[PDB]
Amino acid sequence: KNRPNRLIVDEAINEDNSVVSLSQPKMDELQLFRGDTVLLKGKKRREAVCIVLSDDECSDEKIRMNRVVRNNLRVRLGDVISIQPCPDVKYGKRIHVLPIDDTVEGITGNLFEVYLKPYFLEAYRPIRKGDIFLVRGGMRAVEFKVVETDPSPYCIVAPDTVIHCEGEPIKREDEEESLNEVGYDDIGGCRKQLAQIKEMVELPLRHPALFKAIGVKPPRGILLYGPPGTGKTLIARAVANETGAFFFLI
Amino acid sequence: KNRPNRLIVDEAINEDNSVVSLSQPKMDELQLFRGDTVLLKGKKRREAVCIVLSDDECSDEKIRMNRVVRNNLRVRLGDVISIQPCPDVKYGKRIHVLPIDDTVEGITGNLFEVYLKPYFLEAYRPIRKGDIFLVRGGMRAVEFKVVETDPSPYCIVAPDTVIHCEGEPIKREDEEESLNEVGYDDIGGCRKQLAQIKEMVELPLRHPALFKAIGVKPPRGILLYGPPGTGKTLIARAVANETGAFFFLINGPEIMSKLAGESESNLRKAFEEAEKNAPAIIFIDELDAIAPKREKTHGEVERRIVSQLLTLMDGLKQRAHVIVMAATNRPNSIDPALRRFGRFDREVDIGIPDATGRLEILQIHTKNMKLADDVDLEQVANETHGHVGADLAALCSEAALQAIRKKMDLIDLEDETIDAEVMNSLAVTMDDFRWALSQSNPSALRETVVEVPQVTWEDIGGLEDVKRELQELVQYPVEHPDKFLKFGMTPSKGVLFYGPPGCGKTLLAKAIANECQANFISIKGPELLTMWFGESEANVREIFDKARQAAPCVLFFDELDSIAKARGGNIGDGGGAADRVINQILTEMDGMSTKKNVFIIGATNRPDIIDPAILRPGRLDQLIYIPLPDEKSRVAILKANLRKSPVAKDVDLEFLAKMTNGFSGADLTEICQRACKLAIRESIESEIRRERERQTEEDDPVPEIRRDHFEEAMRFARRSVSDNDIRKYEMFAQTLQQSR
Ligand SMILES: Nc1ncnc2c1ncn2[C@@H]1O[C@H](COP(=O)(O)OP(=O)(O)O)[C@@H](O)[C@H]1O
Ligand SMILES: Nc1ncnc2c1ncn2[C@@H]1O[C@H](COP(=O)(O)OP(=O)(O)O)[C@@H](O)[C@H]1O
Ligand SMILES: Nc1ncnc2c1ncn2[C@@H]1O[C@H](COP(=O)(O)OP(=O)(O)O)[C@@H](O)[C@H]1O
């Protein structure tokens, strides 16, 4: 559009899995409110709906996004997104959601009572078709994909609104990378070395054609070290998953 | 034509890529002017047009030519050229130039706007058909070939004249060697070893039929060495490209990876290939991987390949001008059977670069990076002690990547795709280099540095007679050998400075090593102690080996009494003054060459406990006593220390020298450093107080180190030598010089 409405995505710090946090300036400047719901459009015509918060630390051009919704938009870390305000709360009536067969196997139990009951309890969670969300509990982290929403194609669940959980779990799609995979959110005690590794492998992997178009030396060999079981292979797979580059393991 | 109009080409020093510089004499003598354009005819009926300049250093028969125009004439380095005057400026009208597809690929952008616009801006550049020129920018160096010129066949572009850049890039020709290849212009910090290598491989490669027509021994094996990533393979390819000799490259691990018997086939066939395409140069990279020492070889498969290499080296030296240059990290890490004559007889020590060399390396790698204006590579080159060429190359690339990473990638990430525009606009600030050099590069070497120290004679206050004696002892045997031979005297090869600590012994060593422009090797106390404790005195040999490899030199052992006082002082250990290390110093000093221009200097602030078997003739025998300064010298010391720091004008140094009596030369530096500390504290505190201004950002107060700052720095003055030590030195002098 070439006018300022696009933002750069980055890591998140909040424990809520269905919100996006933006800086107090960009909040007033984008003509938005605290708590107001919006649409986040990313790549491959896949948008979503989210809630906005305020965070002093995050900068203006930067937007906190946790891995679940960041993966939902089909975008990956370090890319650009378009935020559009939508105060059009089309309060839901019934949801048709089913789990995935891959994440749900052996799990003897009425999943409705055990997982979603405190999950959607007094939860004003907005949902749109094509959103694979997740909820944790019982030494498990279960994935749920919504197929059929009463308010088409998006809604917001009210505390009164029912949730309708009939059906068999569905086989996973070819264009969502599952969330049992590793990401930067998992690596706890190495947030400083992760800065170095991200700044080293950001440009060669995210922007490959750039180094084709420039005479400059890229970093080729990286030697991670440290005592065993510290998280080296973890960091490798995490970087591979976040930048989306193919990962061979020798 | 057999009359003087032909010249010898050689290297260039100017940064302009379309001119030739000639000596002021040959200028008047050839009937030419300064700036006048001429024709340069070379081989294969390919001439060019150029501009002439004046340069005092270049000699009469020699002509500065940079690699682009030198390659344009189809000639190579060391050949002869014909210069003809042509004041016929046939001022151009339109040019038809197109790039090469090889150099131009991926380069999204209007090349006309990004490269040629400031290139030909007010540029009176002469052009002729068949000229492939180049222009640098945007982390690229782009080649342009002219096909069709309005004034036929040559012209000169005026600032008014248009340049017409239509068409697709053309595929490169078979008889121009592309300029991404390496040449002598690229190698920065090895301009001295390059002289040796060029004089060694000039005649066998440039003039091959001459050695066929003469019975004389050619150099066959050359062993380049030095720490990794210093530029060995670079020098090899550079020599190969400049002399135009075929270059075969043998990689150590590559050959050593193949199966048993496949590797020897590869070596044999490689030598055959190089023999077939003579003149040739074989480069056996990482020789210490193929042929290590016999102790580290075990198993037939290794020794067999070493033997095969030996046999091939011995065989090649029958009627076959193939020079074999091999590279290794350390020379005493490879098989000693190789360094015997006929196989590897010439040895070259590349060594780590120095300050001027590092600055040159930086200029080489920032050649097309579009630096910012605040970039002062002097500071950088002064802060890169420990870096080799690979380190500096990676530093420049990392600074470039940081400049791409901060802005101009994420900023134009959302609006518009990649383009050449942003590449031109990237100015890499001095802060960026400060960051890249700050933490993100571990300097990859901590060896003994060999260089010509930057200390000069005015950096030292007082000690004039010691200066004339040092000049006499170091200079006269090299500058007037005939007097020494006539009078039969033998030139001494050693001095022993002695006196209070911190008075200028190391300063004098560096100064006299600088005045003669000879290398300097410092061997401090901790090193001798490390060789004594570790019980490895057999490293002393290696030290002297360096002094031989870098002749002329000044080998400087300071704190020579360190071992002598480590095992107790005057009484100390029950033994005598003979040590494990000092004995090796005696052995190596007695057994050096007759005159190899290596001048050993010692230093000791306790001359009574030094091993008296080193003060005997044939060894360090000139005892020079560095005394405590006087007022007329302390003034000079204070001036020489303070001349780098901005100091006020009302401060009287003569009063300081009056009050600071018997202060050793180090105390007069501690005073200045402490006063500078006080001034810096005041500056930062005033800065913070002016930052408490929140009522309204203004210029910092006058930073002249002022008086009444020394009045505080002087409060904490210490004398680092008692009168008792002065008395001891006095007694030493009195007894040893006057007793009987
Ligand atoms: N920094 C870390 N952050 C999160 N989990 C970790 C970390 N380090 C270790 N772990 C846990 O221990 C496992 C071991 O990690 P791994 O990459 O196999 O260690 P290494 O490769 O160093 O032997 C991880 O899979 C994870 O379960
Ligand atoms: N003396 C030098 N002059 C210019 N560039 C150098 C020099 N030394 C190293 N470099 C840079 O680092 C690279 C390493 O050179 P290389 O010949 O591979 O080192 P070595 O063979 O000693 O391991 C060169 O290609 C160049 O990019
Ligand atoms: N005569 C002098 N002239 C100039 N500077 C001196 C003089 N004497 C000592 N210094 C200062 O003392 C410092 C250390 O002196 P140094 O020569 O290392 O002592 P030593 O002679 O014991 O090796 C040097 O940085 C130098 O600036």
CSV table of C-alpha atoms in Angstrom, one decimal, chain B residues 53 82 182 235 291 372 402 459 535 638 660:
chain,number,residue,atom,x,y,z
B,53,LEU,CA,51.7,12.2,-14.6
B,82,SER,CA,56.2,1.9,-26.9
B,182,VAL,CA,44.2,-12.0,-8.2
B,235,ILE,CA,50.5,-14.9,-3.3
B,291,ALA,CA,54.3,-35.0,4.5
B,372,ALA,CA,31.2,6.6,5.3
B,402,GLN,CA,25.9,-5.1,10.1
B,459,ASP,CA,60.4,10.0,21.5
B,535,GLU,CA,62.5,-26.9,31.3
B,638,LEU,CA,57.8,15.4,30.0
B,660,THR,CA,61.0,15.9,40.5
